[PDB]
Amino acid sequence: EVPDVSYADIGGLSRQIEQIRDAVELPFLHKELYREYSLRPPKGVLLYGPPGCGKTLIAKAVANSLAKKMAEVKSYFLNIKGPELLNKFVGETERHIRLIFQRAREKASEGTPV
Amino acid sequence: EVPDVSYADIGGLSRQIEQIRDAVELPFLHKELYREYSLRPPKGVLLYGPPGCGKTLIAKAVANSLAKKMAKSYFLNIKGPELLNKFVGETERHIRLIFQRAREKASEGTPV
Amino acid sequence: GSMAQEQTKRGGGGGDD
Ligand SMILES: Nc1ncnc2c1ncn2[C@@H]1O[C@H](COP(=O)(O)OP(=O)(O)OP(=O)(O)O)[C@@H](O)[C@H]1O
Ligand SMILES: Nc1ncnc2c1ncn2[C@@H]1O[C@H](COP(=O)(O)OP(=O)(O)OP(=O)(O)O)[C@@H](O)[C@H]1O
Ligand SMILES: [Mg+2]
Ligand SMILES: [Mg+2]
């Protein structure tokens, strides 16, 4: 179920939204210019702050933006609950992590971020 | 196998590169020289320090430099949680098979 | 000086007939 919240629905954050939007789009809006400087896209994003200040709201906005971008050209955004991947068997959790990352890198391409 | 890494990429770590050369590269380059002085080659090298200080960088650099230095070498990378299986079996079988293959490649003559 | 409570991790087991 694609969320229906966009960047226009978030207020009071004209800087953090700008930073995450840059880190998500700029490496893929201008691939050749990034390659000219040999600057790779960032691979680690962390969001922290007091409870109920808009972190999940920004996550939903990013998901909606990715959905719109892909529809312009659905399964690229992967949502994982915190302890969801945890399993009682000893080796199942590591195998699940590896399978998730392998599937994510399977669909990864230069023009399509995952 | 990870190519395209060398000591030239790593900067600011001069003594440690020399030590890792002495412990690893030197026994392979010189064996009769070690046997003349009855000096047993060091078998195990551990790398420790603050996170992100370049342990994996030095590892891949030495892995490539061993191949480039000799005038066919095999580098094996295995992680901890990789060799864990939910079944009662294969928890130890995989490790024993890996070491048997390492011994086989050593018998072939290629350093492992 | 503290007490702990254990959570078990089940190991796979399968038999035929
Ligand atoms: N500009 C804004 N800043 C903060 N909250 C907003 C803003 N606009 C709307 N909200 C409302 O704040 C609510 C909580 O936002 P969000 O779910 O992103 O925080 P959270 O991830 O629950 O935080 P935590 O998980 O730490 O409690 C949303 O339901 C949303 O309706
Ligand atoms: N001279 C240098 N020494 C250490 N790291 C360097 C050096 N030059 C660049 N780096 C950068 O440091 C980063 C971390 O390197 P590396 O992956 O070896 O750390 P690490 O030992 O794996 O850290 P951790 O063990 O915490 O994961 C690399 O991406 C590399 O680009
Ligand atoms: Mg939340
Ligand atoms: Mg490391």
Side-chain angles (χ1 to χ4, degrees):
Chain A
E1 285 301 331
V2 42
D4 39 334
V5 177
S6 58
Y7 291 141
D9 305 326
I10 313 177
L13 306 176
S14 59
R15 178 198 314 168
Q16 297 82 357
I17 291 185
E18 175 172 345
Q19 296 180 14
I20 183 176
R21 193 175 181 181
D22 295 335
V24 167
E25 308 185 320
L26 266 60
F28 297 84
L29 291 184
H30 311 287
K31 293 187 291 294
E32 38 85 11
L33 186 49
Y34 267 66
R35 187 187 312 272
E36 194 171 14
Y37 286 77
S38 297
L39 180 54
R40 300 299 89 181
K43 68 175 180 299
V45 182
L46 166 69
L47 308 173
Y48 68 95
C53 291
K55 306 177 300 304
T56 313
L57 194 64
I58 295 181
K60 298 171 67 178
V62 170
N64 186 21
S65 68
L66 286 181
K68 292 195 304 178
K69 178 197 300 178
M70 298 316 298
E72 182 175 8
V73 174
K74 47 182 300 179
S75 177
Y76 293 79
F77 190 92
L78 297 176
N79 163 242
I80 303 179
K81 312 296 183 302
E84 163 174 286
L85 302 180
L86 192 57
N87 188 280
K88 60 174 174 297
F89 292 104
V90 291
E92 279 288 68
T93 165
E94 338 288 344
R95 185 191 57 84
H96 259 294
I97 293 289
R98 295 174 304 187
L99 192 149
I100 289 309
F101 273 104
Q102 186 171 354
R103 292 199 305 105
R105 72 174 61 180
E106 179 70 18
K107 307 299 182 178
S109 183
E110 290 280 53
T112 59
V114 183
Chain B
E1 309 287 341
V2 41
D4 298 358
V5 62
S6 58
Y7 304 146
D9 297 324
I10 299 180
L13 296 175
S14 61
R15 300 273 66 87
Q16 287 72 7
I17 289 184
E18 188 170 359
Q19 301 306 322
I20 197 62
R21 286 183 180 178
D22 299 339
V24 192
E25 299 181 2
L26 184 63
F28 298 157
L29 297 184
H30 306 270
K31 309 175 185 179
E32 55 171 356
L33 287 76
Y34 267 86
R35 183 164 288 99
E36 284 170 347
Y37 294 84
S38 301
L39 187 62
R40 197 190 72 173
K43 173 180 47 172
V45 182
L46 176 60
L47 307 173
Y48 66 101
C53 286
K55 296 178 292 301
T56 310
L57 252 292
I58 291 187
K60 55 184 62 178
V62 73
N64 196 14
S65 70
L66 257 313
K68 291 182 176 179
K69 185 74 172 183
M70 57 177 177
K72 69 176 185 60
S73 64
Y74 199 76
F75 170 78
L76 210 170
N77 61 324
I78 180 62
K79 311 309 181 296
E82 292 192 294
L83 36 84
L84 290 178
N85 193 13
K86 61 175 182 178
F87 305 97
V88 290
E90 207 179 356
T91 53
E92 188 189 356
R93 186 185 320 275
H94 185 44
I95 319 177
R96 189 184 299 183
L97 290 183
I98 287 181
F99 274 89
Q100 287 289 349
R101 298 300 83 80
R103 282 195 180 97
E104 180 76 12
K105 299 303 294 298
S107 62
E108 298 291 339
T110 64
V112 48
Chain C
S2 59
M3 300 301 168
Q5 307 183 58
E6 187 70 18
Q7 302 194 29
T8 52
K9 305 173 65 178
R10 175 183 172 89
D16 307 73
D17 296 358

